[PDB]
Write a protein that binds this ligand. Structure first.
Ligand SMILES: NC(=O)c1ccc[n+]([C@@H]2O[C@H](COP(=O)([O-])OP(=O)(O)OC[C@H]3O[C@@H](n4cnc5c(N)ncnc54)[C@H](OP(=O)(O)O)[C@@H]3O)[C@@H](O)[C@H]2O)c1
Ligand code: NA
Ligand code: NA
Ligand code: NA
Ligand code: NA
Lengths: 499, 499, 499, 499
């Protein structure tokens, strides 16, 4: 259809999306159904590549792709990304519709993601703020006298971009952009759950001029991807997903450069001097956006005694006034969760909190196989730590509320989860804020706002179980680039006169 | 003895070195013999820690060490490292003697390593050139308007420093220095082959004021160390060693920050316009230094036809005039190899080259279980690629010599090995040099000098099978530090007026 | 006409260009004739502002302009510059025609300048590579313990951009771009000799959305501009012009931030191993481009004995084959010099060289009041230093040729002029090149190419009499921005625990 | 005496200090008396150089000094500065005594300045955080394809360091250190008022190994120094002093690189949520330290209505409890002002404030020709702006106190003075603090502390009448260094393949 006109194959009434094998769209592997969480119906099929096609694709990426990407000057790479942005932008409605149907994303959120993808592509020139190399004079040590160094970055070669289901379009475009801008070839491996947006993005890139042998899109399910990760032709792996899969990926990959964005949720702290209107609004939104299916979703709210009552009151009201059900209605605030399993886990998690002294302050009602109300569970500090909702990341619209004596207890409870992605702090006192900033063990802290990675204007990434390394405009250069040092020796050659 | 007076325990006529358990020297595990390659005799014993002591040590490092190191202000950390430098310097002869006896290192090389360790410690202030964070204004995007970012570095926590046998003193001091200067606690795991120098360095650091609960020295053999690497309290692993072990380390460690310096040898290219006197001298030295037991040792020499004859002639003469045997004589140029196995492998490798058309131009004679002559094997370009000396790193004083038609063939053969640590290029033409620099796939290129990492004044590290990431003054901050982003939200707060 | 439709006033058959007074185009001062060097005819008139209008303009720029520019977020400033680029691009022929007629620039050179202006505007996002601030931790000194610093850039306010005649369009657009991208208001003061292109550029910027009260274009002759420079509301002065005027500007301005690009010519050195075809081509072009009316024009050629003959032979041939006369013909290689005076000076300078032992190798013939042939004058090393062509910058297509014994003499003669803008070195030996690079006292050295600032992709600027500070993408931030340091004190506040 | 044993010449009972003429201590110019503000007695004499000696000194600095400094490798420069630190440190009491006697500085302050000088010297290695150059790849523009750039810093040559009377030791050592660490020669021109400490510092540097022909110390009074500033061999001028003299210096110097630290006082703002104990303490100290003879002294206190009463009450008490009189007593809090004139001006300024509605809250009594009590004058917001104490910098221990309605009025009044050096803000609310930070027009803002430049750990400098450019560890590289760009051309040379 338009963008994917000659690519998609209507077979048996259901559109069949092929993989892109670094040159031609195709695939001879098993076909796999792709369903919508809105009605559990099959909306398309994707053709996975065969072992032989995976092998051939990697061979093309390694032997030719690395050079096609590297030998396309930066000035053209930029033109490619900008053109791709234009193509995605003019196909906005189509990109959004697929996000709504395939991911169950509310219309406004789907439109927001497409626009993030477009902006990420257009701002590729900002990534150059970290591209320059270093010139190191040698006269600061006797052994390096009359010597000199140049340190420059080089692309690693083939980057494997593995993406999650919750940001099927942005994550693929983001990783492709930063991997490509520095001269790398890329193998994209999207969630087999909602791989359609990536296929659409890759086509837009190909139409825009992206070297055809420098990119690949493989519709491989879970462990079928290990094959790519473990291959020596893959110099780097950019992975966004769960802690457990991330661990498996590194153990399969071995020595390579990695960026591991492993999520988990985020805690939000509200100090007694906080603007409770701003806090309640931002916290409610951080809890329910995209039905809590956000790595930076708020999963725990900690509020100092003097504001805990009002704060939790306001958040409860806001969550209760939300409208759930089918995401197409520009009226719905919350669509479905990606699978009935995800809802099952949320319900069980809520029961666990209740059995351990927790009390539901809002929501709690399952509305269908993939529908549930955003839930806010109050818990006493002395018991919250043993609750599943605390110890784990329940990927759903659910957060715990805990009253705390002071900042130290807030910080202590916030750091008590095994994760350390982001944290939020609402308050105004510079000293308490500076203290929280120093002691919260997370990759990023949001002062007076809900955690939101956006397009990575500010770098983000994990600590503890949330992973290692960062993504962000400019900063991602560290994950897909290697340094090259050139040491020039002029010892006794008369350039310098003892210096 | 002096430095290790109350630490070393003379038991059964052989000095017994205990492990340092983040607080007290001790150990209840198996005792292990430490031998000299000079005479295969046992010169000491080291006490390995028990599982329980490993567990307790990690617990101390994690619960207290991270904070002792982090809460010691940088100004004191620097004083600690400087004081340690003074202590090692005044104990120079003792440090050197142990290197000579334990590692079989020629006196001058042993003295050189101690001085490198001392300088590395004293120049810790230079590591600060990469410590500052970034302030990111938010008005360059509409979504971040009235927003602002601060990105600063933080220590990761506990860094596991795993070191090889060939630089038993420097590698431990280097990793400790860059890990500690940024606020990390450190677990050192030296080669069980020559762990004595590390014990001496750690004691000097402790005497200098290094927080006692922030450092540990565990004498664990090979796979006993996996226990440390795989532990969640270990946030980073700095490993210098072989490709194969490095792979195992990552597969055991899983997600963490890694610096993998995996060696392999280096190729040296000589262009027709090169100063052949300089080239022959530097290349000969790169081949035999420390009996080729250097990750940056020259293992392949490629010379353009018009200079190949003279060049190879000169290098052969130089290697032949070398004096082998016991390293104590300030007369000996080459001491023994670390083990009889290493020599066996070298001899077999030489036979392989010969059976495949290779011709010995210098050396070739084994002089004892751990002694051999520096060898230079000529090989025709059409057969060298299948030789063990080419396909593998034979850790010994042996290199291949190959005549080539031109630069492209030189580059092609240089890149043909599975490694990519450093490469050397001797010549004067800027264009040919720039071309080689762009196309040699290695972490570092040395123009008109043999490859020499020194103390890391210039960053170095691998490509391909030689690993990932870099070590160097300043640059090592990337391996033992994590970024922390703080996003401040002032939306609608009146700080800015639409900007 | 189109772009300047309602701005230009046809009065007495000659188009009258008004000044832009930070809000409205106008002027009540003396009217001044603008002539073409192609035929000495009056092609337009410009209205200079009255003292009162200068005062009022500065008042608007200071009281409102600083804030209009600063309060327009960077994201919009960028959109403004990009839109201006589009407007200039679609009006390319018109912009070029005026450059050809007003500056006497050959068509291709005029087209080249317009395109440079367009690209400079479009690449404003690259200027951000130097916009970020610094975060300075305080624990590296005892006195700053529990303290912390943030260093960010801020616009200075009102930047006075004073431009020369030889790049009437680019220089104005360049200075405006880097001054505006960081948040400054700008007063442009173009050469009263060819102020038309600036008027056209400013209009394009205004049409593009440039805050109307944040920019001004004042058609003031020479010393009438001192009034602007000396004013306290002008925080910076970006000046490109002659050494003598630059000196006067600083002496009138007093304490302020300055960028002084004071030209002078450039020497070119040819080593014995140089590609003489490349060298002859580039050197000939550096001598005659835009009739030598380029600050980076080659004014002295120094060649080692073994190549001097051929080199100078080839350059002479190339200069002789040039076609002079009226710049409209896409056939002409060289148009006229800006004024008959400039030609007079060139002729006198040639006579001086001849009277002192110099010999004309090419050109020498004046072809009219403003026309002359590109001239190449040979001179013996022992007499060249006293020649006007050496001691001074003769802004015309004329260069000296001097044979030298070796590199040291080349370097010595190159450094003998009172200028130090750029220098060129053709050769291949890295050591000789590195030596020349270290010893040539100039802001920039071009290896194997003629000196060419282009759009400042690489920073450039002077040494010695050629001025101070640099212009260039990114680097110009230093001239139009000031640092702001914020020191936070948390002494004894419990953020840190002794560190 | 010891340090200056063979240098000082006891003549007529009064020690005579000669100038240092870049090689030998001497001087044939007029002798000038140096007096103590403690008793107006002559304590020494300094020999000014003759015109001929000034000329010869500059000739030595230019022809040999530039090279002696530049050709001494950085590693030795550092050793020189460190050794000088040791020499000054062991002569601490002697250095302090002279500061007490010559500058009238209280013992503790004199000891503090010597220690700042010592630390500044020892931390010269931190200045290297800004010494590295940039490597600029050329493929981000079509015109620069197959091209490449290197941008490195170079010393300017001869830096003229002109210093004020209030920090006679530190300012000279600071400027010398940052000028020398990057490879420059230096001419020091101290205040003829208290030039003794500089003579002592220069000797310590010479004894430490500072190249003898690379430094000069000229005891020239006021306008006699213009001769140095105006000379073409002086590539940069680092000046710390009054606005008026700074202006004269630039007008005499013309085009050169300048750092102008022109002082003026600083305003301090106290928000309603401020810790008034901390604020009162820090503000009182900022008002009286060294008898207000500090460029960063607090001259205006602005406090929000709800805390104004207490705050001003507390500061008054603190100022009243101070002990004035002869600085030798480790008991005295405040010594004398540098001259009776300075006190006259302060008294007249106080009368002016009183005649305009001001009321003295503390002090006001002159105690002798050079002694006065620290004074705090209350003034109504509607009249303060016309007071001399507001409009001018009265270099003495005197500040105005003004009650304000809110932050906007505080900011408005703070920005109302013609200066913009530093400002202080005491309070805790992040939003109000961020607002003040954005709107205060000064080089530096101190949050919750009095303004204190210290040794420049954090860069500082002026805005408005307070000057241009910054000094600070690292940042001063901009004032005494110039960039050198090297552009390499590989167009069509086969390094890149279209990229
Ligand atoms: N260093 C570089 O990068 C660079 C680049 C391009 C050109 N240049 C140099 O500039 C010169 C060619 O340009 P040009 O002939 O037009 O030189 P110029 O006369 O020095 O240009 C001076 C600019 O300053 C104005 N001006 C003149 N007197 C002034 C005064 N007293 N106060 C304030 N402003 C004053 C001029 O306006 P009026 O036109 O009204 O006199 C003109 O706009 C050559 O020496 C060339 O090498 C240097
Ligand atoms: Na692997
Ligand atoms: Na793990
Ligand atoms: Na002025
Ligand atoms: Na001058």
């Amino acid at each position: 259809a338009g963008l994917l006109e000659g690519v998609i194959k209507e077979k048996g009434g259901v559109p069949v999306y092929p993989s892109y094998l670094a040159g031609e769209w195709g695939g001879s592997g098993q076909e796999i159904e792709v369903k919508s969480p809105i009605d559990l119906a099959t909306i398309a099929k994707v053709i996975s590549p065969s072992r032989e096609e995976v092998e051939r694709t990697l061979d093309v990426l390694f032997k030719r792709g690395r050079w096609s990407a590297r030998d396309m000057p930066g000035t053209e790479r930029l033109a490619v990304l900008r053109k791709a942005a234009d193509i995605i932008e003019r196909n906005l409605d189509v990109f959004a519709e697929v996000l709504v149907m395939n991911a169950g994303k509310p219309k406004s959120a789907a439109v927001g993601e497409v626009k993030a993808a477009v902006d990420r592509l257009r701002l590729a020139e900002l990534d150059l703020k970290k591209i320059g190399g270093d010139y190191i004079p040698g006269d600061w040590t006797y052994d390096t006298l009359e010597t000199e160094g140049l340190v420059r970055r080089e692309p690693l070669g083939v980057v494997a971009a593995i993406t999650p289901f919750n940001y099927p379009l942005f994550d693929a475009v983001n990783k492709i952009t930063y991997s490509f801008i520095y001269g790398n070839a890329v193998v994209v491996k999207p969630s087999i759950s909602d791989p359609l947006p990536a296929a659409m993005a890759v086509k837009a890139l190909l139409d825009a001029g992206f070297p055809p042998d420098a990119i690949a899109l493989l519709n491989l399910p879970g462990k079928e991807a290990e094959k790519i990760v473990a291959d020596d032709r893959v110099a780097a792996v950019s992975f966004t997903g769960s802690t457990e899969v991330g661990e498996r990926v590194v153990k399969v990959g071995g020595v390579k450069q990695y960026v591991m964005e492993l999520g988990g949720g985020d805690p939000a702290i509200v100090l007694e001097d906080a603007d409770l209107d701003l806090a309640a609004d931002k916290i409610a939104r951080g809890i329910y956006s995209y039905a809590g299916q956000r790595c930076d979703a708020i999963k725990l709210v900690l509020a100092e005694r003097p504001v805990y009552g009002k704060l939790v009151e306001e958040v409860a009201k806001r969550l209760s006034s939300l409208r759930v059900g089918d995401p197409r209605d520009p009226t719905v605030d919350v669509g479905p969760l990606i699978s009935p399993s995800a809802v099952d886990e949320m319900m069980a998690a809520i029961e666990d909190a209740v059995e351990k002294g927790g009390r539901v302050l809002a929501g709690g009602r399952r509305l269908g196989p993939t529908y549930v109300q955003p839930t806010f569970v109050e818990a006493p500090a002395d018991r919250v730590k043993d609750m599943v909702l605390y110890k784990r990341e329940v990927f759903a619209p659910v957060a715990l509320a805990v009253e705390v004596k002071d900042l130290d207890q807030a910080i202590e409870l916030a750091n008590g989860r095994p994760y350390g992605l982001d944290a939020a702090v609402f308050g105004r006192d510079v000293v308490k804020i500076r203290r929280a900033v120093r002691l919260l063990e997370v990759g990023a802290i949001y002062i007076n706002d809900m955690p939101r990675h956006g397009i990575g204007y500010y770098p983000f990434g994990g600590r503890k179980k949330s992973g290692v390394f960062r993504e962000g405009i400019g900063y991602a250069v560290e994950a897909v680039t290697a340094y090259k040092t050139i040491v020039f020796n002029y010892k006794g050659k008369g350039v310098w006169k003892y210096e």
